[PDB]
Amino acid sequence: MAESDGAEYRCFVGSLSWNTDDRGLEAAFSSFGEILDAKIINDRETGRSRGFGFVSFSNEQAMQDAIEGMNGKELDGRSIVVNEAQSRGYGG
Secondary structure (H helix, E strand, O other): OOOOOOOOOOOEEOOOOOOOHHHHHHHHHOOOEEEEOOOOEEOOOEEEEEEEEEEEEOOOOHHHHHHHHHOEEEEEEOEEEEEHHHHHHHOO
16 A cells, blocks of 8 residues: 555644643544654744644554544643644645
């Protein structure tokens, strides 16, 4: 099977803060399957969080059973949103 930038299991995770990082969303998603990455983004000059990033899985079943359950859950004291991040990442 072809794992490409068009055909990977990568999705967006919003909730994060000046207290939360990629480790904290990885620890909420690691219970579904084996993680490839998580990203947390801020302006490192300004000290200002975007408060989101991406999470990615080694398997599709883990991504889809997560997303269908994840809508409106609470991580690190904040309410979350989930959607796919493949086409916005590919830019096509």
